[PDB]
Design an enzyme around this catalytic site. Sequence first.
Site, short mmCIF file in Angstrom:
data_model
loop_
_atom_site.label_atom_id
_atom_site.label_comp_id
_atom_site.label_asym_id
_atom_site.label_seq_id
_atom_site.Cartn_x
_atom_site.Cartn_y
_atom_site.Cartn_z
N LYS A 1 62.94 98.08 -52.86
CA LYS A 1 61.83 97.30 -52.30
C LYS A 1 60.48 98.02 -52.22
O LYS A 1 59.44 97.37 -52.28
CB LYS A 1 62.23 96.67 -50.97
CG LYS A 1 62.49 97.62 -49.83
CD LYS A 1 63.28 96.92 -48.72
CE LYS A 1 63.16 97.66 -47.41
NZ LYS A 1 64.30 97.37 -46.51
N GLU B 1 76.08 81.83 -40.63
CA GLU B 1 76.45 81.01 -39.47
C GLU B 1 75.89 81.50 -38.14
O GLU B 1 76.23 80.95 -37.09
CB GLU B 1 77.98 80.86 -39.36
CG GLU B 1 78.58 80.00 -40.46
CD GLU B 1 78.72 80.72 -41.78
OE1 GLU B 1 78.96 81.95 -41.78
OE2 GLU B 1 78.63 80.04 -42.82
N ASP C 1 64.52 89.98 -53.80
CA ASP C 1 65.61 90.03 -52.84
C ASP C 1 65.34 91.07 -51.74
O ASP C 1 64.59 92.02 -51.94
CB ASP C 1 66.93 90.39 -53.53
CG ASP C 1 68.12 90.25 -52.62
OD1 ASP C 1 68.22 89.20 -51.97
OD2 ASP C 1 68.94 91.19 -52.49
N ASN C 2 65.99 90.88 -50.60
CA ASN C 2 65.96 91.86 -49.51
C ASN C 2 64.55 92.07 -48.97
O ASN C 2 64.09 93.20 -48.73
CB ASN C 2 66.58 93.17 -49.96
CG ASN C 2 66.85 94.10 -48.82
OD1 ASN C 2 67.00 93.66 -47.68
ND2 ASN C 2 66.91 95.40 -49.11
N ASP D 1 65.28 93.32 -57.53
CA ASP D 1 66.63 93.37 -56.98
C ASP D 1 66.89 94.34 -55.81
O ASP D 1 67.43 93.92 -54.79
CB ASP D 1 67.63 93.68 -58.10
CG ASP D 1 69.04 93.84 -57.58
OD1 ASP D 1 69.50 92.96 -56.84
OD2 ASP D 1 69.67 94.85 -57.92
O1 LIG Z 1 73.26 94.80 -59.13
P1 LIG Z 1 73.42 94.24 -57.71
O2 LIG Z 1 74.58 94.89 -56.98
O3 LIG Z 1 73.47 92.74 -57.67
O4 LIG Z 1 72.12 94.67 -56.92
#
Ligand SMILES: O=P([O-])([O-])O
EC number: 2.1.1.6
Length: 213
Positions: A142, A197, A167-168, A139
């Site tokens: 990193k 966008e 993630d990230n 999460d």
């Molecule tokens: O616990 P989080 O704010 O989704 O990273």
Amino acid sequence: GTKEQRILRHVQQHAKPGDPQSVLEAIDTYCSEKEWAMNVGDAKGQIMDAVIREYRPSLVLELGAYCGYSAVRMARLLPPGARLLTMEINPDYAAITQQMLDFAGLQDKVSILIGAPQDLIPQLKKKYDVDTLDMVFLDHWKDRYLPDTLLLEECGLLRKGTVLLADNVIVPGTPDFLAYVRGSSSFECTHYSSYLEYMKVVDGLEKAVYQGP
Ligand SMILES: O=P([O-])([O-])O
Ligand SMILES: O=P([O-])([O-])O
Ligand code: NA
């Protein structure tokens, strides 16, 4: 208060109790307005949902939490018999995450373990009666993605088909984690880049499916 406290306060004042969708929207809207994180639902939430729908895990491990968005996002999709374990070293983040899940009505879907993954991961089998994991969501920290992944392997917690979703992961960040999972024949990898966008990556995710040692 702290950013995570302010996010929780906002949810408590604006979201519908017991309604995970309302909670997610409240977090998303607030973080976008504050320019802390732009449209997290489109940038990472939809991808998280797609992975959970594709693999249908019974046991998910989340490594890292901040305000609980990700835990709510995943837990709301788990049927009876399926569950989430969330490990987080910072007790303030763990506390907000607990209150966020409580507000969403999802507390019985999740166990929050407070401590370092280095310390807790080796306890999962013997202390928490885990055999193997169906999915791992990495999460927030990193620089820990690679060592966490290696420790999960060392502890025998990954099986053929276990899906890791991180993630990230946005180039040129996490260069060692990516070189490892992509270079290793033990992982089948897919990268997701969310642009919303515009022209620049807003969030990047790596899916790595374990193929055995
Ligand atoms: O616990 P989080 O704010 O989704 O990273
Ligand atoms: O950067 P990308 O992932 O190719 O979009
Ligand atoms: Na690979």
